[PDB]
Ligand binder design. Structure first.
Ligand code: 8K2
Ligand code: 8K2
Length: 209
């Protein structure tokens, strides 16, 4: 059972701007998704401060980066608060309509795409490097779901029958043919050291073969 949804017009406009605008500094996608993961980990930690059972689904709070050259995917895993089905449909838990509005007025006022994160819609910078994005998520109050979109105006949501997560969010980036540099160990390490050196959670870069 797979449900298909239309993006709100403003969000469709944002993703086409990200996909079509010439902008060479694509590496900021990773900073934005790691920062999103850190925000989600902050939220489950705060909730657990007054109710420890919120961590029965997983005590460890961390971020993993998993490149896979065979599948040409880069996956960002965190054990944060996760997302409900309603959250996924609701622009992945963001205020994306008002955020896109403020972002686009900022761009005509001197901004560039790199401050997308200041407007709450940093997730969509994933489409600087990915032709398709899959999001697997598990929230304590809901079941495990999978979100997917290749842009073009629509996204899908289905119950995920894959590997159980426990709690958190998995962003799978199906990389464009000319963006495979972000599967290289020394290139990921350079970006994490440049942009994410102060994230308050352990970031583990997996190796291959
Ligand atoms: N869409 S979002 O809520 O910024 C987000 C992307 C990845 C997460 Cl973990 S949370
Ligand atoms: N260690 S983990 O983040 O659960 C993971 C290992 C392999 C994946 Cl694919 S996801």
């Amino acid at each position: 059972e797979v449900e298909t949804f239309a993006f709100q017009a403003e969000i469709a406009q944002l993703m086409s701007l990200i996909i079509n605008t010439f902008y060479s500094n694509k590496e900021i996608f990773l900073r934005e998704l790691i920062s999103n993961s850190s925000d989600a980990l902050d939220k489950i930690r705060y909730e657990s401060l007054t109710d420890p059972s919120k961590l029965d689904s997983g005590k460890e709070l961390h971020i993993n980066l998993i490149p896979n050259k065979q599948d040409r995917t880069l996956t960002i895993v965190d054990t944060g608060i996760g997302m409900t089905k309603a959250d996924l449909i609701n622009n992945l838990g963001t205020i994306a309509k008002s955020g896109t509005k403020a972002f686009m007025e900022a761009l005509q006022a001197g901004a560039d795409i790199s401050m997308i994160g200041q407007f709450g819609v940093g997730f969509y910078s994933a489409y600087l490097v990915a032709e398709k994005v899959t999001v697997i998520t598990k929230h304590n109050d809901d079941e495990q779901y999978a979100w997917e979109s290749s842009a073009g105006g629509s996204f899908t949501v289905r119950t995920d029958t894959g590997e159980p997560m426990g709690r958190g969010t998995k962003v799978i980036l199906h990389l464009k043919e000319d963006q495979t540099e972000y599967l290289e160990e020394r290139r990921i390490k350079e970006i994490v050291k440049k942009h994410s050196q102060f994230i308050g959670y352990p970031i583990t870069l997996f190796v291959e073969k």
